[PDB]
Amino acid sequence: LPALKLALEYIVPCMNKHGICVVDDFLGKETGQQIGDEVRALHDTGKFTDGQLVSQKSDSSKDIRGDKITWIEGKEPGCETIGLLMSSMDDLIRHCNGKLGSYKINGRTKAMVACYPGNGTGYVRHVENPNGDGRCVTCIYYLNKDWDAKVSGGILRIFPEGKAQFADIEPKFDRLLFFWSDRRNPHEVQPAYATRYAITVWYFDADERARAKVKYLGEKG
Numbered sequence: 001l002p003a004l005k006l007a008l009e010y011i012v013p014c015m016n017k018h019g020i021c022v023v024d025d026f027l028g029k030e031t032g033q034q035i036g037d038e039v040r041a042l043h044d045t046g047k048f049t050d051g052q053l054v055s056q057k058s059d060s061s062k063d064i065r066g067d068k069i070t071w072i073e074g075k076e077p078g079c080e081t082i083g084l085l086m087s088s089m090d091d092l093i094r095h096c097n098g099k100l101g102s103y104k105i106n107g108r109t110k111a112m113v114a115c116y117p118g119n120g121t122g123y124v125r126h127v128e129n130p131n132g133d134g135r136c137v138t139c140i141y142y143l144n145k146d147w148d149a150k151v152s153g154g155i156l157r158i159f160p161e162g163k164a165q166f167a168d169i170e171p172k173f174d175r176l177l178f179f180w181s182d183r184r185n186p187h188e189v190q191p192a193y194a195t196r197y198a199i200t201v202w203y204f205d206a207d208e209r210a211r212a213k214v215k216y217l218g219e220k221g
Ligand SMILES: O=C(O)CNC(=O)c1nc(Cl)c2ccccc2c1O
Pocket: 067, 069, 114, 123, 128, 140, 155, 156, 171, 187, 188, 189, 198
């Protein structure tokens, strides 16, 4: 699907109405698998961190660690297809710009590739950007073929503001997710009992980012 039809007939209206938008079959099976292969290779060759320290015991051997991450620019050897994904995300956002709320997106982060190792760890309820650091949209791409949450857990649960209801997102292969990064969307990752991969990019609003700079402010003289 042209990034444009997707953006204009689905992503823009869905984001403006619900603040959450799920796109299935974003890149297709061949490309999705290549990205999966690239991410698994990063994992298998030790490029991820050891995982978030979840519980720290007096005996460090007993320490429990959770989500593992690596930061990817998309230009690294063996990361080209991740780079293609990132360029594809950028295309969608470009076609959305000026239509996602009143935001004007002018930049993004590198990609954060996350691996929940499947040891029953998840990610606590949180807001992405509670203090105004510039991020207005979170974009997540999932890689997990034939994921079944009834057996593997790992659901992303969002708690949209004002509503008495969940939004439960399975981390399905070739699924792309957008949601507002601010306090409108507190969310959590439920315990994952199988290896679970995702790739996240955050997009910046030009005005919020420009004034965030005042919080972390250098020329000599
Ligand atoms: O993976 C998911 O479906 C949802 N993930 C998150 O909400 C999430 N958020 C943050 Cl801020 C971090 C931050 C660091 C590492 C992993 C994270 C994560 O998985």
